[PDB]
Write a protein that binds this DNA or RNA. Structure first.
Ligand SMILES: [Mg+2]
Ligand SMILES: [Mg+2]
Ligand SMILES: [Mg+2]
Ligand SMILES: [Mg+2]
Ligand SMILES: [Mg+2]
Ligand SMILES: [Mg+2]
Ligand SMILES: [Mg+2]
Ligand SMILES: [Mg+2]
Ligand SMILES: [Mg+2]
Ligand SMILES: [Mg+2]
Ligand SMILES: [Mg+2]
Ligand SMILES: [Mg+2]
Ligand SMILES: [Mg+2]
Ligand SMILES: [Mg+2]
Ligand SMILES: [Mg+2]
Ligand SMILES: [Mg+2]
Ligand SMILES: [Mg+2]
Ligand SMILES: [Mg+2]
Ligand SMILES: [Mg+2]
Ligand SMILES: [Mg+2]
Ligand SMILES: [Mg+2]
Ligand SMILES: [Mg+2]
Ligand SMILES: [Mg+2]
Ligand SMILES: [Mg+2]
Ligand SMILES: [Mg+2]
Ligand SMILES: [Mg+2]
Ligand SMILES: [Mg+2]
Ligand SMILES: [Mg+2]
Ligand SMILES: [Mg+2]
Ligand SMILES: [Mg+2]
Ligand SMILES: [Mg+2]
Ligand SMILES: [Mg+2]
Ligand SMILES: [Mg+2]
Ligand SMILES: [Mg+2]
Ligand SMILES: [Mg+2]
Ligand SMILES: [Mg+2]
Ligand SMILES: [Mg+2]
Ligand SMILES: [Mg+2]
Ligand SMILES: [Mg+2]
Ligand SMILES: [Mg+2]
Ligand SMILES: [Mg+2]
Ligand SMILES: [Mg+2]
Ligand SMILES: [Mg+2]
Ligand SMILES: [Mg+2]
Ligand SMILES: [Mg+2]
Lengths: 185, 129, 175
RNA sequence: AUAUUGGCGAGAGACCGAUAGCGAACAAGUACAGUGAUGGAAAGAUGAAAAGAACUUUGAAAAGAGAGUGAAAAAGUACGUGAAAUUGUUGAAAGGGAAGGGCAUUUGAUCAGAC
RNA sequence: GGAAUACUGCCAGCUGGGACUGAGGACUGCGACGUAAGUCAAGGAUGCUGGCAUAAUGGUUAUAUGCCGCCCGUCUUGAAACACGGACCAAGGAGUCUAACGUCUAUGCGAGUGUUUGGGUGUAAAACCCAUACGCGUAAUGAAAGUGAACGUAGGUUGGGG
RNA sequence: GCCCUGAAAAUGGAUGGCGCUCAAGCGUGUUACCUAUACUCUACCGUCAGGGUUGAUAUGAUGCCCUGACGAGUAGGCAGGCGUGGAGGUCAGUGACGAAGCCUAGACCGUAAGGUCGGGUCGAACGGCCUCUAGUGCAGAUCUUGGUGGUAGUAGCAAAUA
RNA sequence: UUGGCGGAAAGGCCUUGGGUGCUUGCUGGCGAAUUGCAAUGUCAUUUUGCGUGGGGAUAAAUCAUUUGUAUACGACUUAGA
């Protein structure tokens, strides 16, 4: 037989196609999967892997996080691609013009960007303008801010958050959380 | 009456009866994998019965092909029969077991006109005989 | 529907074969066989008889006489591998042989309606021979027979049939 | 305005379909057991209509054989369909302290594709 | 003094016999022989001929013969066991529903979100429509009284897809 | 070194047996030979990986095609499937010119779960596909209810005078 | 056909004498094909049933009945024209 130096038939960890049944979503793939083939343009490969992600890994990108990136030196006229949803923010005021191509815009977010004289584009109108993806800025949402991960790797002295239903002083504040009662963590 | 195709080799022709299906009457002949911990079948001792497994797979070119070199597509009535018209060198119409003696003469007679192989040409129609 | 109509069906176009590279070269006979050599027929109707080798035909067979007026084997085709060639020899020089080709030996075309109808119903339907063959058998023989009267005992030899006796170990016997 | 596994009256159902569903689809809280408190079953389907087999014959008689009713008696009040264990008859086969199975072929039986 | 032979090795030296396989299906490639057109053993089998079409080949099945094959389930380090259950057959027969939750995935909307307690209406337990609240979220932290998140383009450094 | 004495166990008895004595014994050496699911080569099945292609140009883009590697498995995890009762949709599906059920060392499809046809019986309803739902798949539990064997024409049918 | 020999399981082995076929010891004359280029290309020896023609011979056993030298029952042993 063989001596196997690694596990056999082991399939790559990666999503090869969106686990969603959304018809229109699978269309988008059909487009970009063809572009990833017939252009070099590392950009297109990035988008294709992006379409596949689960909703947890396509966290919302604020409007203000777009505004921030357009203030990076020399970036003014770049068009910013977000695969995922763009959302509104009430916190910024004076908003630049530009263009933003995304999977989804919430209503407020769309009204925010057009009222500034800008433009809202889908992923395909993005491919017609930029087949290679010329002059485009790809952004990602802050995926470690998600609530659930406050609990990850929970363990002594890890500074992580106990999974718990309701918080008051009678809940897990006593023995092992302070030196007066037993020890501290 | 068909496309040429490679020669069909079934590669295992025994039926794979269940272990001990012969010995006890309560045990039916449909296959079932022996799950037991001591089992001499599950462990593959020499001279015990074969187990079905994917290696006995049939060639993709000839799979679902009848000996006549056809696939057999089940047909309930005259308007079904007419879905096969193009593929007449590929698929061979079978007539559904429950069709009446009277409607079969109409299926057969209409499939003669289209040149389609019927795989059970003598139904209750030779039963009129 | 008794069964739901499939989503594909294949194309009924039957693809042509690839251009094959095989050339039909000339067959090369083994060393032993030379025109005039005496042969031993190893199967068939005349199996066991010893016979005389004339020409090598286009279809890779061997033209044969024997000759007929001796051992009663006619002109005939024989496949090269069904023979044992002996080391003894007669001169085929004065023999024509230039006439006989593959077409000459062509069997009469058999009919599928007549070979069922005349074979089954009449089992007494009798064979006949083309007057031609029987004459061109004569011609061959009168040259051959005249040569066979040169060497002693040869005439008896060809008429007498060959077989293995006890203790005969064919991997030994020289022939 | 809230409750409601009881009582009376209606309406339903992605519920069960006679070993299920109430214990109980039927003369069931019956028959039957126990001193008693209690315990507590089995059991639906001939056919559209009994038209449920006159009459002949054999037997002491049940019955049998014919006959006839019937679309059907391969529906005969042992009754729709009628599985398996198990059993009888006929047929085929084999058999020196079990039988049965796997690989391969001979012999016999048998059968599809063929065009 | 002169050779020969054995032994070990090489040949992009030559030839005879034998058995198994024939995948693929237009052409694309690498080559070879050629003065030349072209041919070839060069990215996988074709050419010639015979018998039979008819139970013959093949399938199934009974049987014989060679060789192999302990009785299944189960606990056990270890079961053919002188460990346990199993005479036989049919029907029944064992990870379910709910309250609250975790990770993951899907869908909606998105700094918001959740119509269905209730009200409106209705082809009536459906479907459709809706006020105010309330839940969870948008702020933490302390036992508490209590305080409550921009020196800087929301900072510097090192990587970092695009 | 070999061989012998030393050397005694219970049913009959075990270099596996037969039997072998310049061996068919022991020591050694040289070749030839037999044979595994191992190795090599080819075909086919599946899995994984890397890659090509709807560019206007018929019938699957979860598709077609190319190349390579790999394939033991209890407890256990995941994936694709077959089967059953009911539900929404659909084939203007099948049916008294025979629906379902049962029978069949008759045929075909599938690695298999099973599916399909033919014949016999039978007499009123029933399937394919896309989805929904579950009281959804049996060989075992000294399982539960009913039915029936071997045992077996056997044990037995013998107190109280006839 | 004349004689002999063979009891280990002899079922055969020699021999006299004539009849009859063949004789490749030698010398000749005719025939063979087409079974088509190979297909065991069938010839052997075992029983058993019928059929023609001739020779031949012309019985027993069991049950039932019966004895008791025997006996669980069969079996055994006797007798009966
Ligand atoms: Mg391997
Ligand atoms: Mg099969
Ligand atoms: Mg074990
Ligand atoms: Mg109530
Ligand atoms: Mg009940
Ligand atoms: Mg009592
Ligand atoms: Mg009944
Ligand atoms: Mg009635
Ligand atoms: Mg009837
Ligand atoms: Mg009964
Ligand atoms: Mg009754
Ligand atoms: Mg009945
Ligand atoms: Mg039975
Ligand atoms: Mg050498
Ligand atoms: Mg080929
Ligand atoms: Mg040239
Ligand atoms: Mg055969
Ligand atoms: Mg053995
Ligand atoms: Mg133990
Ligand atoms: Mg065991
Ligand atoms: Mg023991
Ligand atoms: Mg125990
Ligand atoms: Mg027991
Ligand atoms: Mg000793
Ligand atoms: Mg011994
Ligand atoms: Mg010894
Ligand atoms: Mg040994
Ligand atoms: Mg030995
Ligand atoms: Mg030795
Ligand atoms: Mg791939
Ligand atoms: Mg495995
Ligand atoms: Mg089905
Ligand atoms: Mg149910
Ligand atoms: Mg039916
Ligand atoms: Mg059966
Ligand atoms: Mg259950
Ligand atoms: Mg069951
Ligand atoms: Mg059972
Ligand atoms: Mg089990
Ligand atoms: Mg039991
Ligand atoms: Mg009993
Ligand atoms: Mg008794
Ligand atoms: Mg009594
Ligand atoms: Mg007694
Ligand atoms: Mg008494």
């Amino acid at each position: 037989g063989i001596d196997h130096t690694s596990k056999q038939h082991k399939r790559s960890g990666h999503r090869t196609a969106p686990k969603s049944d959304n018809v229109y979503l699978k269309l988008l793939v059909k487009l970009y999967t063809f572009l990833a083939r017939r252009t070099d343009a590392p950009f297109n490969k990035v988008v294709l892997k992006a379409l596949f992600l689960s909703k947890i890994n396509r966290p919302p990108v604020s409007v203000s996080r777009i505004a921030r990136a357009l203030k990076q030196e020399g970036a003014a006229n770049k068009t910013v691609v977000v695969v995922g949803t763009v959302t509104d923010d009430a916190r910024i005021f004076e908003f630049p013009k530009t263009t933003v191509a995304a999977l989804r815009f919430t209503a407020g977010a769309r009204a925010k960007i057009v009222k500034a004289g800008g433009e809202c584009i889908t992923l395909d109108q993005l491919a017609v303008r930029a087949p290679k993806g010329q002059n485009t800025l790809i952004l990602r949402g802050p995926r470690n801010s998600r609530e659930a991960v406050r609990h990850f790797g929970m363990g002594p002295h890890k500074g992580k958050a106990p999974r718990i239903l309701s918080t008051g002083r009678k809940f897990e504040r006593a023995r092992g959380r302070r030196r007066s009662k037993g020890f501290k963590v | 009456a068909s496309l040429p195709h490679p020669k069909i080799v079934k590669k295992h022709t025994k039926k794979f009866k269940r272990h001990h299906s012969d010995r006890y009457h309560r045990v039916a002949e449909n296959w079932r994998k022996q799950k037991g911990i001591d089992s001499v079948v599950r462990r593959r001792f020499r001279g015990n019965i074969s187990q079905p497994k994917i290696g006995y797979g049939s060639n993709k070119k000839t799979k679902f092909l009848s000996p006549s070199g056809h696939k057999t597509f089940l047909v309930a009535n005259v308007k079904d029969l007419e879905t096969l018209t193009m593929h007449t060198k590929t698929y061979a119409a079978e007539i559904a077991h429950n069709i009446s003696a009277k409607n079969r003469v109409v299926i057969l007679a209409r499939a003669k006109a289209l040149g389609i192989k019927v795989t059970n040409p003598k139904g209750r129609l030779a039963l009129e005989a | 529907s008794a069964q739901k109509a499939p989503k594909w069906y294949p194309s009924e176009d039957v693809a042509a074969l690839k251009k094959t590279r095989k050339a039909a070269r000339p067959q090369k006979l083994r060393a032993s066989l030379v025109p005039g050599t005496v042969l031993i027929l190893l199967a068939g109707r005349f199996r066991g008889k010893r016979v005389v080798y004339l020409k090598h035909l286009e279809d890779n067979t061997l033209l044969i006489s024997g000759p007929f007026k001796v051992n009663g084997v006619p002109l005939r085709r024989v496949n090269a591998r069904y023979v044992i060639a002996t080391s003894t020899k007669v001169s085929v020089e004065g023999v024509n042989v230039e006439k006989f080709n593959v077409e000459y030996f062509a069997k009469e075309x058999x009919x599928x309606x007549x070979x069922x109808x005349x074979x089954x119903x009449x089992x007494x339907x009798x064979k006949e021979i083309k007057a031609e063959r029987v004459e061109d058998q004569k011609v061959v023989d009168k040259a051959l027979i005249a040569e066979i009267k040169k060497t002693p005992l040869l005439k008896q030899y060809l008429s007498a049939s060959f077989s293995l006796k006890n203790g005969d170990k064919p991997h030994m016997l020289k022939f």
